[PDB]
């Protein structure tokens, strides 16, 4: 089967603000990737092997709102630009890639999967460039190999004149390293 | 929810249609030059290409368009009228081989359906099944480029 994805908004602006302050989210969770927000920005978080990982430049050291109140981060690595919380009950985790493929597929916050060709352990190029605005909000999103396994988490875009042609990502290897750190 | 693939029917038979780039495409051998039904009345084809066995009307309601493939992958996936996915290895411009041959019945009524790549993007439109004695082992398809060109 091919990689297909769909998105669902489970909460609005005002419910989000209350939940941020409250720290208690009673909503049911589903999916591998969570659309996430702070009072300042919205991005993505990917559940891999039981841990909900996201980009440190988006989450900082914040707790994640859960049905039992705020949950402290399990891993924080400013250097790796990673933070991880226990995956929410209801989410499904992706498993790391084990095929060394160089044809990755970035899943965006709009649930579009775009092809990128690996050009190093932390970079790949879009086979079809898109406006930087189209990639905004996708930090922390997954880069999948042809089998649907996590190869990395989108971090930054290499763009010019407002068009991104490449993407910088955090390889899963840095996740395992961060866990033992 | 909106669909990319419409399960269509004509008096003679039923088959599929796939929305790509705002156009609902299907096979001429199924629709011919027939018009498509709508709440406002029959809407005519925007493109009719008897040669390529390709016809297209503007995308209907409750539909959403599929993105053309740009990764050149040859690990294709055919989707049937029953929503079954069938792995297909691309043999050429308009040819592909099932990784596991199935009876023609299994691929029956799926013409017009999409031939997807690993990213779920449209590679081609299922033209016809190539079967040896009732078992389809391959498929014939219209590449998205033909659609891109035709429009």
């Amino acid at each position: 089967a091919p990689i297909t994805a769909y998105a669902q908004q489970t909460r609005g602006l005002l419910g989000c603000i209350i939940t941020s302050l409250t720290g208690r989210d009673k909503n049911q969770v589903e999916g591998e990737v969570q659309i996430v927000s702070t009072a300042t920005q919205t991005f993505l978080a990917t559940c891999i092997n039981g841990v909900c990982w996201t980009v440190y430049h988006g989450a900082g050291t914040r707790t994640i709102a859960s049905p039992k109140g705020p949950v402290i981060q399990m891993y924080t690595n400013v250097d790796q630009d990673l933070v991880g919380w226990p995956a929410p009950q209801g989410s499904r985790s992706l498993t790391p890639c084990t095929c060394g493929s160089s044809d990755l597929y970035l899943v965006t916050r709009h649930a579009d999967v775009i092809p990128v060709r690996r050009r190093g352990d932390s970079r790949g190029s879009l086979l079809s460039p898109r406006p930087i605005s189209y990639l905004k909000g996708s930090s922390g999103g997954p880069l999948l190999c042809p089998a649907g396994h996590a190869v990395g988490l989108f971090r930054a875009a290499v763009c010019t004149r407002g068009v991104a042609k490449a993407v910088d990502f955090i390889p899963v290897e840095n996740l395992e390293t961060t866990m033992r750190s | 929810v909106e669909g990319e693939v419409q399960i269509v029917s004509t008096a003679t038979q039923t088959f599929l249609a796939t929305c790509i780039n705002g156009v609902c495409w299907t096979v001429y051998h199924g629709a011919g030059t027939r018009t498509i039904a709508s709440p406002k009345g029959p809407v005519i084809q925007m493109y009719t290409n008897v040669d390529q066995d390709l016809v297209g009307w503007p995308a209907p309601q409750g539909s959403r368009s599929l993105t053309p493939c740009t990764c050149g992958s040859s690990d294709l996936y055919l989707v049937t009228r029953h929503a079954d996915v069938i792995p297909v290895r691309r043999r050429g411009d308009s040819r592909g081989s099932l990784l596991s041959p199935r009876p023609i019945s299994y691929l029956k009524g799926s013409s017009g359906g999409p031939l997807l790549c690993p990213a779920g993007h449209a590679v081609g439109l299922f033209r016809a099944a190539v079967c040896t004695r009732g078992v389809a082992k391959a498929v014939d398809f219209i590449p998205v480029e033909n659609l891109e060109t035709t429009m």
Partner: peptide, 22 residues
């Protein structure tokens, strides 16, 4: 600071489906 809040989800585990007539 406030907690990070889940405002949506993206599902990859979905397979093609015939939209139910409801």
């Amino acid at each position: 600071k406030g907690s990070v809040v889940i405002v949506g989800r993206i599902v990859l585990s979905g397979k093609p489906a015939i939209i139910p007539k409801k």
